[PDB]
Design a protein around this ligand. Structure first.
Ligand SMILES: *[B]([O])([O])[C]([C][C]([C])[C])[N]C(=O)[C]([C]C1=[C][C]=[C][C]=[C]1)[N]C(=O)C1=[C]N=[C][C]=N1
Ligand SMILES: *[B]([O])([O])[C]([C][C]([C])[C])[N]C(=O)[C]([C]C1=[C][C]=[C][C]=[C]1)[N]C(=O)C1=[C]N=[C][C]=N1
Ligand SMILES: *[B]([O])([O])[C]([C][C]([C])[C])[N]C(=O)[C]([C]C1=[C][C]=[C][C]=[C]1)[N]C(=O)C1=[C]N=[C][C]=N1
Ligand SMILES: *[B]([O])([O])[C]([C][C]([C])[C])[N]C(=O)[C]([C]C1=[C][C]=[C][C]=[C]1)[N]C(=O)C1=[C]N=[C][C]=N1
Ligand SMILES: [Cl-]
Ligand SMILES: [Cl-]
Ligand SMILES: [Mg+2]
Ligand SMILES: [Mg+2]
Ligand SMILES: [Mg+2]
Ligand SMILES: [Mg+2]
Ligand SMILES: [Mg+2]
Ligand SMILES: [Mg+2]
Lengths: 204, 226, 212, 195, 196, 233, 222, 196, 195
């Protein structure tokens, strides 16, 4: 009944020293029934990464929408969109459906190509921006993620240390949620290289 | 949320806490609730976060175009009128509860706005879940002919009452001072009485602790030449 | 929850999962869903945790009183009927139970009774109970025979729970195995699904859908 | 309607769909084909609310056939599935949404690969090795998790499908009057007349 | 809310409390419920603060545009514009308004517009939650052609009682005097009117 | 299950160095109607305890009779009724707390919020809260209804934690209580100007003050406030 | 309509050591968005080297603890001052809770102490009486924030040994009382940051063969 | 319903209208709401006619049995018996009763018992639907130690207004005078009190 | 449970009762005997809410067996049916009524006549030549109206019963997993093991 917890899933993002990390589980279900273990929730438009939790049809629809908009942006601007700008675009786009909203929990992550500054941001389903320094969480195990992140996180982590922190934050949060898990992906993002890692986790 | 506005000798000051909540969870610990409508018209917002942001940007945008059209600095009553008529039209569904303040060629002004579109005038005002804690402080310590220093003190004390006693409010105190014949000074994190203590332990993991299945380089660059 | 029990040549196999949830929140992964009623009787637990616990340990007290009074082991039929008659008194009040009462006696042989909070009491050869019962049934029905070895029967029960643990969101944690003979039940270990899945996938060649 | 299954093997996609049409009290028909050919190498099975199912399927069929004539070219299964998803994603926020779930089994002649897509009435698309809609999956996914190997032949796929249908006939309460099985491969679409 | 308008020899006086409540919390204790739609046509507002403000703002706009074309409008005309808004939007409004004005030709006039949108011209009018408690008092004590001082005392004593008994009413008693002489604002504080 | 009819509003209280102060206005409201203007909601029990009650007045009067009856019963066969075996604040509270929770458990609650303020035999300050649900808690400052939202913030500025109690004098504490009562009169639409205040000191005993009034009120600034935004006249 | 239940917030945490056990809980008591008390003790010494806390609706929590303390008293009277073992206490509490199966104590009960072999023990209950011995359990408002952290940092879940890459797990080495208290404090500091009903103070009761000791720590008061 | 009891120098007077309504239909226009529970202890009844009759009948029974054992009961005692019934059966009753009596020791006394079952001893009391409209009037015009003639005029004028504004109230104004001299019944018809 | 049928022929009563036991989603058992022998020449089939059905049947069985021992005599089918009706008529105004419908097939040894009684959970008794409970009658009564002649043999009764079961298997949505057939005549009660 509750659209935001029919399919299930989670996304988490963190900042480190000259880097950002964004991670998501791979589960898509119909309430109790697990349907797919390859449903990735993180997408990217140039060097800007977007994770989306919530109702899966809207996750897909918004990805296709932001691909649409970022491609037109690039043709006209003659440059790739930046994380700060994209964050504002997501907020605009979500709020225009104020009274008929997409049931989603988007999470932006990336590094500004000009300043080199790491950036993360979160939103509610209707556009409000949560621009945190440390970390952003989203999905059916958001409470669990808040607890993990708030204890495990420390500032200025190196990329390979940040990987361990975000992975453990996701994995242990997902294992306390019935509608999350079934695999996981972690993106480690630096100014001009991005590493994608699939995590080994319990498949129940 | 605790937001307050206090009039003084030569202007007006507004303040706010920095806690945003989703039920009993804190979504953001350092949220920015003071919004700029124009250079010398600022308002604090309570209620639904997206709505206070969106309604402020829209009116602030139209106020800017109006200022350019009329070749005049914007007035608080204009922002007030545009906000109330917008909110009234949406019959309370746009959940924005605003304290609008500012200085303009007419003078200094302080108003409150509610989601249904009603406005109120005052020398001291408070809105949000911690407005009762704040209003208790304002009703106890407010007087006529406050100085700038006294008004900032009173405003931040009223926010603190919200921070400590209201669960819907917390973290830091933001302030914005708008004095006549001067630039408005936005004091982000004016007070910071809620820094987290050092943790007992470091939870930095040994590298290789997490089990990995696959690795790959992601192509973020464009299609290449040659 | 996924619990199963089936009769075969070597007696009865009982297999259960370990998960307990409150909504989408996983409350526990280490729940004992099998009650050791006596050295010969086992009860499975599904539905309301407390209802099953309270009344099945209560059942053990009634079974002990029977054999004190009658100087004879209680039958699986009599034991199951004590529980079904009890819950029937509470019918409508909101008890939530799906249980198998499993045992061996001389007069009956290996016997399984499905007992239910709606008052249903059914004797049978195979039963699967819980939110993940349908998943367990698939594996069981396609691989079941009367002529299974204790070793092969134990694996089928383990595998059927694993199947459900994977697909059913409200099942998982670990697998508890029991084997019931005429000299009593015999515990066959706690098997974590987090290790069992990758072991079974590799050795059996199954779950080719999932990447490991 | 009730049970629709799909399984993608080495070189083909196999769709099984129940024959029963029950209207409340009575089974009105026991030979209903719950599928439409969208293009020579793309088949769509469907199940949902009465009327909506066929109306939607035929509407999609017409649109793909129109595309085929205009461009003198067959769309890829991926392309067709994306078109279908968008229609359902559009539909869910309509005055009266299409209450239809579908499976799209196609053979991509360009990549020489069979492809199976599962899409529900909300517009939730997933590519799978095997799929189902409704209560079917609850019984069948456990069997498929165990037996499916991706290098299976079409004959092995049909045997694994028989094992699914047997389990459904044993444990499901509703009599779905057997299934019509159809195979989609490089040579097109054909129906297995004896199952 | 306790509001009233009273005609007298020299014109008309509007009176009101200053309390705005959200349930039992007093959101504003110094509210101005006496509002101006024209130089010498004012109104008392009761009910929804948003609705009565929105209405009053629209009426002021209509009478400003009327004045620019046809000169000063009558109090009856102002009441008609209020009525048109309250009647045609009765399903969506919660507004109890008293319209009071001063012409030189017609002198002091008072029109009350309750929830329905009906209009009633009266010598004096009372409205708001607190008015219920002073029907007896006002009926017994009202006279026509009172003096300015007598009318101020009549309103002061009346609203004093309405405030005393009604929780929704309180704070200061505001008054606005409308005569040929001009527009005079009066205020009366708790220490003054409570001891009456 | 019922609904409250005639109701009393906030009861506020705090500890200070040698004892406790408690206060409550003299109003009995009937919905929005301010029906009864002479209702005493502070009820003393002996010379060492004062029970402040808010909520339903019929249920208050019932509780008042229970406490009156409790004193009578304690005196029976008790030569030390006015000495070592006199009723303590802790005894009176626990009794009420038992009754409140029993009544809620029978789904027929006494629709009240109660604060028992007093001083024990050993000179310790007693201040504890109980309500219709049987929920109990203690704190350096306690308040019911609107007092919880508006009084507590002000009273906690005086005594923020346990260590502030010995540093707070009776003059400072009473001043804070009287100010809080004024604030409640400004802002509570079901309050009255008239109130009662009780001080239970370990040295000077029980001082019960009746017919107090909220004074030194700020209203003058109201004259400058015109319209709701754009209006100038 | 009268609602006999309420939510007083708070959060509790039990951890079983090798020869000790701790039961911690914040001291904040709330209704809705108001603080009732910044110091209202929630974890109680019930005698016989058993500590208890019934988190949730405080009236039902206080009633249950009161009745269990009473049960310990009558256990001594009826059975020649015999010490009530932690397992026996747990079963007794199941019956107390289930006795009100159809009008439940709306609480999350945890008890801690030592088993009859002297090892650390923690038992956890749901509102209607289902219970289970555990090594680790958080209960109450911020239980969802704390439990995942404890799965990771107490049971070393999802942790493996460097160099082996997922093959060899991190060994389950025992934790000292000083190490546990660090994890408890960090759990409540973190829970306070992200949960509005958690704060003010943290009170920990430590149970060893020597008896019951108390430790108090300040928490953020916003 | 408009009912009131007023103490004065020589004792106490009870007053009431005579209207009983089923919705907007007047079932009885000459009702006697002033009822006797003892020689010089009477009560005014408002709310449910069945409930207030059943209560009054029971109270009269209790005071009759009290008198047979312990002699004449006090007015306070009568009010307590009313309270016990109204409080303990609050869930099932709809009764607003004013108890008024005359002792020689205590003289005139008035106790009001609203819906809840609470008791309030007062110099005078007003109750019933029509009382809302005369709070202002009664508060302003009541004095202690009035004469018999002044109190009759006070009650007559008060209930006249309550009747004028309240649809549930009407008919004749009944009164009962309680003094050392005895018990006097008074009646006042529409033609008399409407012109006041 | 689901389908229970009854038919009274020349010299016997035949009761057919489905074997399926379904709980919501799954068919837990396909060999359930929905009947109890009340006395040597009286059989009662039953269908209704879970738990209540067996609890009621066994309660009736116990009472009749008690009567049989006390009087050393078998009650007539008419007498047993009247006892059963009263229990249900008592039950319907209870705190929690028995939600059970029954058929009582008996052979009266005194009158040498087979007798079939249909009783619903309200305590509504009727003697019939053929009867049914639930949705069964909707399909079967038309066939029985046509074919039943009252002087049929037991073998003719079974053939007419097969025609009923075939129609049910064709048109009913639920798979009731066939029926257990039992014959009640002068020689007592026996089960037809092949049907
Ligand atoms: B304050 O408490 O009024 C605060 C001020 C806001 C402008 C930052 N409000 C919130 O934080 C609201 C509370 C709320 C919750 C649920 C519905 C409506 C309002 N929070 C949000 O708007 C919110 C919630 N989750 C994510 C983002 N924003
Ligand atoms: B199983 O999922 O049915 C399980 C078996 C039980 C013996 C532990 N039950 C639960 O997990 C139930 C919820 C539930 C989920 C799915 C179907 C039926 C019931 N949980 C509880 O009873 C429970 C008890 N204590 C804490 C949390 N949850
Ligand atoms: B008065 O009490 O009618 C008053 C007059 C208004 C013009 C200021 N109305 C209010 O105070 C209303 C509530 C109300 C009370 C009584 C009857 C009808 C309505 N209040 C508001 O409209 C309000 C309250 N808080 C914030 C904004 N608006
Ligand atoms: B009065 O209006 O309260 C009046 C006093 C009663 C003692 C005669 N009550 C009634 O007239 C009631 C209705 C009512 C009106 C107003 C408030 C509460 C109740 N009428 C009756 O009880 C009645 C009406 N018709 C027949 C019998 N009883
Ligand atoms: Cl206003
Ligand atoms: Cl009458
Ligand atoms: Mg999980
Ligand atoms: Mg699972
Ligand atoms: Mg799907
Ligand atoms: Mg409106
Ligand atoms: Mg007032
Ligand atoms: Mg906190």
């Amino acid at each position: 009944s509750d659209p935001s917890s029919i399919n299930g899933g989670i996304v988490v993002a963190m900042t480190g020293k000259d880097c950002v990390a964004i991670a998501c589980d791979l589960r898509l279900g119909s309430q109790s029934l697990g349907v797919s273990n390859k449903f990735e929730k993180i997408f990217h438009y140039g060097h800007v990464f977007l994770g989306i939790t919530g109702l899966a049809t809207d996750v897909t629809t918004l990805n296709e929408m932001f691909r649409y908009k970022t491609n037109l942006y690039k043709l006209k601007e003659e440059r790739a969109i930046e994380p700060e700008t994209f964050t504002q675009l997501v907020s605009s786009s979500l709020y225009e459906r104020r009274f008929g909203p997409y049931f989603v929990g988007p999470v932006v992550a990336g590094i500004n190509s000009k300043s080199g500054k790491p950036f993360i941001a979160g939103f509610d389903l209707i556009g409000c921006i949560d621009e945190a320094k440390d970390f952003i969480v989203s999905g059916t195990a958001s409470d669990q993620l808040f607890g993990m992140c708030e204890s495990l996180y420390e500032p200025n982590l190196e990329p390979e240390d940040l990987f361990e922190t975000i992975s453990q934050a996701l994995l242990n949060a997902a294992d306390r949620d019935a509608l999350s898990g079934w695999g996981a992906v972690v993106y480690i993002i630096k100014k001009d290289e991005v590493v994608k890692r699939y995590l080994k986790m319990r498949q129940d | 949320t605790t937001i307050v506005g206090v009039k003084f000798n030569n202007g007006v000051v507004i303040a706010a806490d920095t806690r945003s909540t989703q039920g009993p969870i804190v979504a953001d610990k350092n949220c920015a609730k003071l919004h700029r409508i124009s250079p010398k018209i600022w308002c604090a917002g309570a209620g639904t976060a997206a709505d206070t942001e969106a309604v402020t940007q829209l009116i602030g945008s139209n106020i800017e175009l109006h200022s350019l059209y009329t070749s005049r600095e914007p007035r608080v009553v204009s922002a007030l009128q545009m906000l109330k008529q917008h909110l009234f039209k949406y019959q309370g569904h746009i959940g924005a509860y605003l304290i609008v303040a500012g200085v303009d060629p007419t003078g200094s002004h302080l108003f409150s706005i509610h989601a249904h579109g009603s406005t109120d005038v005052g020398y001291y005002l408070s809105l949000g879940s911690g407005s009762l804690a704040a209003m208790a402080v304002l009703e106890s310590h407010w007087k006529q002919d406050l100085t700038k220093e006294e008004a900032i003190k009173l405003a931040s004390d009223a926010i603190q009452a919200g921070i400590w006693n209201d669960l819907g409010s917390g973290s830091n105190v933001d302030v914005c001072v708008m004095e006549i014949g001067k630039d408005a000074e936005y004091l982000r994190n004016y007070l910071t009485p809620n820094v987290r203590e050092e943790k007992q332990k470091s939870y930095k993991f040994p590298r290789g602790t997490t089990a990995v299945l696959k690795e790959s380089i992601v192509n973020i660059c464009d299609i290449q030449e040659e | 929850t996924t619990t199963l029990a089936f009769r075969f040549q070597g007696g009865i196999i009982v297999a259960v999962d370990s998960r307990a949830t409150a909504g989408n929140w996983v409350a526990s992964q280490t729940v004992k869903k099998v009650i050791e009623i006596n050295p010969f009787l086992l009860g499975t637990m599904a539905g309301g945790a407390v209802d099953c616990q309270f009344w099945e340990t209560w059942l053990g007290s009634q079974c002990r009183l029977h054999e004190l009074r009658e100087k004879e082991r209680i039958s699986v039929a009599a034991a199951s009927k004590i529980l079904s008659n009890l819950v029937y008194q509470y019918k409508g009040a909101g008890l939530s139970m799906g249980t198998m009462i499993c045992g061996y006696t001389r007069k009956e042989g290996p016997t399984i009774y499905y007992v239910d909070s709606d008052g249903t009491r059914l004797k049978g050869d195979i039963f699967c109970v819980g939110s993940g019962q349908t998943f367990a049934y698939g594996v069981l029905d396609s691989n079941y025979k009367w002529d299974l070895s204790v070793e092969d029967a134990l694996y089928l029960g383990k595998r059927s729970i694993l199947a459900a643990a994977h697909r059913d969101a409200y099942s998982g944690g670990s697998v508890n195995l029991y084997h019931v003979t005429e000299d009593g039940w015999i515990y066959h270990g706690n098997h974590d699904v987090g290790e069992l899945f990758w072991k079974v996938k590799e050795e059996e060649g199954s779950f080719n859908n999932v990447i490991g | 309607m009730d049970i629709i299954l799909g399984i993608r093997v080495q070189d083909s996609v196999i769709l099984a769909s129940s024959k029963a049409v029950t209207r409340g009290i009575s089974v009105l028909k026991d030979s209903d084909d719950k599928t439409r050919q969208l293009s020579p190498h793309t088949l769509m099975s469907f199940a949902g609310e009465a009327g909506d199912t066929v109306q939607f399927a035929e509407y999609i069929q017409a649109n793909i056939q129109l595309y085929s004539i205009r461009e003198d070219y067959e769309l890829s299964p991926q392309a067709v599935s994306s078109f279908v998803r968008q229609e359902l994603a559009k539909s869910i926020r309509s005055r009266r949404p299409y209450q239809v779930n579908v499976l799209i089994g196609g053979y991509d002649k360009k990549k020489n690969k069979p492809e199976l897509y599962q899409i529900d009435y909300l517009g939730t698309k997933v590519e799978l090795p095997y799929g189902a809609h409704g209560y079917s999956g609850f019984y069948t996914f456990s069997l498929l998790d165990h037996h499916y190997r991706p290098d299976m032949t079409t004959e092995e796929g049909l045997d694994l499908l028989k094992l699914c249908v047997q389990e459904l006939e044993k444990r499901m309460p509703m009599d779905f009057k057997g299934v019509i099985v159809k195979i989609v491969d490089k040579d097109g679409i054909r129906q297995v007349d004896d199952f | 809310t306790s509001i009233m308008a009273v005609t007298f020899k020299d014109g008309v006086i509007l009176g009101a409390d200053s309390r705005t409540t959200t349930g039992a919390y007093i959101a504003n204790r110094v509210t101005d419920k006496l509002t101006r739609v024209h130089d010498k046509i004012w109104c008392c507002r009761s009910g929804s603060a948003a609705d009565t403000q929105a209405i009053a703002d629209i009426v002021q706009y209509h009478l400003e545009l009327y004045t620019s074309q046809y000169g000063t409008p009558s109090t009856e005309t102002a009441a008609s514009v209020f009525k048109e808004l309250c009647y045609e939007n009765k399903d969506n409004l919660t507004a109890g308004i008293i319209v009071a004005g001063y012409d030189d030709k017609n002198k002091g006039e008072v029109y009350t517009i309750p929830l329905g949108g009906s209009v009633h011209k009266l010598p004096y009018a009372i409205a708001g939650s607190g008015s219920t408690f002073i029907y007896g008092y006002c009926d017994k004590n009202f006279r026509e052609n009172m003096s300015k001082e007598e009318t101020v005392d009549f309103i002061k004593h009346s609203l004093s009682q309405a405030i005393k008994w009604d929780g929704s009413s309180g704070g200061v008693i505001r008054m606005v005097v409308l005569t040929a002489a001009g527009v005079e604002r009066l205020i009366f504080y708790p220490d003054e009117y409570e001891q009456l | 299950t019922q609904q409250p009819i005639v109701t009393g509003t906030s009861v506020i209280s705090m500890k200070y160095d040698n004892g406790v102060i408690i206060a409550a206005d003299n109003l009995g409201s009937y919905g929005s109607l301010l029906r009864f203007n002479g209702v005493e909601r502070l009820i003393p029990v002996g010379d060492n305890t004062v029970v402040g009650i808010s909520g339903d007045i019929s249920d208050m009067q019932h509780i008042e009779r229970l406490l009156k009856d409790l004193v009578t019963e304690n005196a029976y066969d008790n030569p030390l009724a006015d000495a070592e075996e006199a009723l303590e604040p802790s005894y009176i509270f626990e009794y009420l707390a038992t009754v409140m929770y029993q009544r809620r458990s029978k789904m027929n609650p006494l629709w009240n919020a109660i604060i028992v303020a007093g001083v024990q035999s050993n000179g310790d300050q007693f201040l504890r809260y109980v309500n219709l649900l049987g929920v109990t808690y203690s704190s350096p400052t306690l308040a019911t209804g609107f007092g919880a939202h508006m009084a507590n913030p002000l009273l906690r500025k005086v005594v923020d934690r346990e260590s502030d109690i010995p540093k707070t004098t009776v003059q400072v504490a009473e001043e804070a209580i009287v100010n809080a009562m004024r604030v409640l009169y400004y802002r509570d639409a079901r309050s009255s100007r008239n109130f009662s205040l009780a001080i239970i000191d370990k040295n000077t005993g029980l001082t019960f003050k009746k017919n107090l009034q909220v004074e030194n009120m700020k209203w003058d600034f109201a004259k400058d406030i015109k319209g709701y935004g754009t209006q100038k006249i | 309509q009268f609602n006999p239940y309420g939510d007083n917030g708070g959060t509790i945490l039990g951890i079983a050591g090798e020869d000790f056990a701790v039961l911690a809980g914040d001291t904040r008591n709330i209704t809705d968005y108001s603080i009732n008390s910044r110091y209202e003790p929630k974890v109680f010494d019930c005698g016989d080297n058993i500590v208890m806390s019934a988190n949730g609706f405080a009236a039902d929590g206080d009633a249950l603890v009161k009745r269990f303390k009473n049960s310990v008293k009558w256990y001594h009277f009826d059975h020649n001052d015999k010490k009530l073992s932690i397992n026996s206490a747990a079963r007794n509490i199941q019956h107390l809770l289930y006795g009100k199966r159809f009008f439940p104590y709306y609480v999350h009960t945890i008890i801690a102490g030592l088993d009859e072999d002297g090892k650390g023990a923690v038992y956890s209950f749901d509102p209607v009486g289902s219970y289970e011995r555990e090594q680790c359990r958080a209960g109450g408002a911020a239980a969802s924030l704390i439990m995942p952290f404890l799965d990771n940092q107490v049971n070393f879940k999802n942790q493996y040994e460097p160099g082996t890459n997922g093959k060899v797990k991190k060994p389950l080495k025992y934790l000292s009382v000083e190490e546990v208290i660090k994890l408890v404090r960090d759990s409540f500091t973190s829970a306070t940051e992200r949960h509005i009903q958690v704060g003010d103070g943290l009170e920990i009761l430590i149970v060893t063969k020597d008896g019951v000791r108390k430790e108090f720590y300040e928490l953020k008061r916003d």
